[PDB]
Structure 1
Amino acid sequence: MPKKTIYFGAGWFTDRQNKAYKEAMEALKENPTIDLENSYVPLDNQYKGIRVDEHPEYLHDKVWATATYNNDLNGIKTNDIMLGVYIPDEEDVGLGMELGYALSQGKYVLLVIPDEDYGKPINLMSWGVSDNVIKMSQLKDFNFNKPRFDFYEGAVY
């Protein structure tokens, strides 16, 4: 069984975001086409462990910001597949940017929406950058070795 690495695109700034984050991670551990251990998770790769909620002294540090930004870009460009855990009502600008970078780097762009939200309107540009969009409960079984283009079964705004 060949295995692909991913970039774990996800907000971590609300309760719905954090719930979906946790669900998506568990789904990935059970997916036999994913090498999760060699994958890139932003929250585990911030420069010196820093997040502006846990060590707010880095809110204005340009060195931390430069290295973390670069590391995230690096995590996209050196992994096979771009994943975007996506809350339709709580969309994230950072993920948006990362989606656009992933497109520029030739990566398959897969959005994953919680089952309870799948169908709800998403930003047109998110719909368009994405190659496919699936429900959280499909993620454990998604075959990342044969990723195909498909349309969201749901609305845009």
Structure 2
Amino acid sequence: MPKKTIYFGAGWFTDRQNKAYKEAMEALKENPTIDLENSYVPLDNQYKGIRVDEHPEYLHDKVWATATYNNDLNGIKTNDIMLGVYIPDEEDVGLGMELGYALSQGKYVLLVIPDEDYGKPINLMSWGVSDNVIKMSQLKDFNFNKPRFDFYEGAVY
């Protein structure tokens, strides 16, 4: 098969986020239309190897912030597809921004929602930016060579 690369848009700040993250990453490893090795994973592309957790003084460093912001934008713009791991109860402003950038860069925008949450209401603008929204259990078999437009089968506020 041909393979496409993605940007792994996913929060890592809550238990539900980290669960969905692990699940989505596992689904991508099993999906044969995805080149995960050459995809952009934010958490493995930390500027200069420095760990924002082990040294939180870097959250006042404007150079760190500039480089990290730009790395993410670059990760979106140089890969085929924008993936948003999306928790309806824990909606993320950063992801929202990235979705808007992905749209502007002409990328397919795919949201993935945990099966337990699929159907719960999501922000209108999330509903609208997305080209499609699927459940976590569909991610391993999603054909990224033939991405199509569809509507969320769920609520929007």
Q: TM-score range by the shorter chain?
A: over 0.9
Residue by residue over 1:60-105, the C-alpha shift from the partner in whole angstroms, topping out at 9 and shown as x without a partner, is 0011100000000000000000000000000001000000000000
Deviations 1:24-70 (A, max 9, x none): 00000000000000000011112123343332010100111000000
Moved more, 58-67 or 46-55: 46-55
CA distance in 2, matches of 1:90, 1:72: 21
Give secondary structure in 1 for the equivalent of 2:146.
coil
Any stretches of 5+ residues in structure 1 without a counterpart? none
SS of 1:144's equivalent? coil
**1:134, CA displacement in angstroms?**
0.2
TM-score after normalising by structure 1: 0.98
Counterpart in 1 of 2:3? 3
TM-score (norm 2): 0.98
Aligned to 2:116, what secondary structure does the other structure show?
coil
Q: Which runs of 4+ in 1 moved over 3 A?
A: none
Q: SS of the counterpart of 1:111? A: strand
Give, in whole Å, the separation in 1 of the partners of 2:51 and 2:149: 35
SS in 1 for 2:90: coil
Structure 1 counterpart SS, 2:57: helix
Residue aligning to 1:22: 22
| Distance in 1, Cα, partners of 2:118 & 2:54 | 32
Moved more, 40-49 or 97-106: 40-49
Q: Which deviations, in whole Å up to 9, do the C-alpha atoms of 1:102-148 show, x marking residues without a partner?
A: 00000000000000000000000000000000000000000000000
1:105 matches 2:99? no
How much identity, in percent, do the aligned residues show?
Answer: 100
Distance 2:50 2:137 in 1: 31
RMSD over equivalenced CA pairs, Å: 0.7
1:40 paired residue number: 40
Partners of 2:81 and 2:95 lie apart in 1 by 14
Structure 2: unaligned runs, 5 residues or longer: none
Q: How many residues align?
A: 157
The range that moved more, 51-60 or 36-45, is: 51-60
Range that drifts further, 147-156 or 41-50: 41-50
